[PDB]
Amino acid sequence: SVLQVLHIPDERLRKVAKPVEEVNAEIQRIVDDMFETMYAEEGIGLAATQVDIHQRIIVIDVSENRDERLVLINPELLEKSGETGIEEGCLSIPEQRALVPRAEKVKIRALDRDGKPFELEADGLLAICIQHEMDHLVGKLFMDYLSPLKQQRIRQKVEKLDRL
Ligand SMILES: CCCC[C@H](CN(O)C=O)C(=O)N[C@H](C(=O)N(C)C)C(C)(C)C
Numbered sequence: 001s002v003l004q005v006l007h008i009p010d011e012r013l014r015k016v017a018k019p020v021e022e023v024n025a026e027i028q029r030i031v032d033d034m035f036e037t038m039y040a041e042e043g044i045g046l047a048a049t050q051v052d053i054h055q056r057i058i059v060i061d062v063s064e065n066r067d068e069r070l071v072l073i074n075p076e077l078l079e080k081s082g083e084t085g086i087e088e089g090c091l092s093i094p095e096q097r098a099l100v101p102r103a104e105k106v107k108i109r110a111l112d113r114d115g116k117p118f119e120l121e122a123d124g125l126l127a128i129c130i131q132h133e134m135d136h137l138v139g140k141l142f143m144d145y146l147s148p149l150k151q152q153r154i155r156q157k158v159e160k161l162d163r164l
């Protein structure tokens with residue numbers, strides 16, 4: 001199923017997710033719906049928070065042909081380094097994009113869709129995305145890195161869209 005994606009300024013977006021207690025069928029369905037939703041929404045990543053599910057779950061596909069599925073359950077940032085930034089966009093902040101500072105490289109530990117633990121070292125688009133998603137899990141948005149002026153503006157643009 002395709003789930004509804006919240007938009008700012010829904011305060012549900014500022015909630016802090018809990019850790020998945022056990023990777024089971026219920027969890028795997030959530031994972032499956034999140035992939036469907038992400039591809040439907042044309043995003044390269046999605047955090048459970050965005051669909052009103054407050055558990056540490058993230059799905060990713062940064063692939064060019066959109067055929068590389070990546071699931072991060074209960075992810076942990078192990079090491080990080082460098083600084084970088086692109087013009088990021090968010091499914092929760094429709095049509096707004098901005099450069100935000102990010103580590104250039106990251107190393108994380110997580111559980112896969114089968115609840116199997118794995119380690120991954122990433123860089124380029126993949127690392128920034130991973131960072132974007134993990135921030136969601138702690139109720140943080142990209143616009144938070146910006147100026148109040150810029151923040152107000154983004155907010156206004158979003159409310160007008162959602163109005164139409
Ligand atoms: C850095 C990863 C950005 C993740 C978001 C989705 N979302 O909000 C997840 O929480 C996304 O797919 N943005 C696109 C994007 O910014 N790219 C640079 C591909 C679009 C704005 C194109 C959808």
Ligand code: NI
Nearest residue numbers: 089090091092
């Ligand atoms: Ni986002």
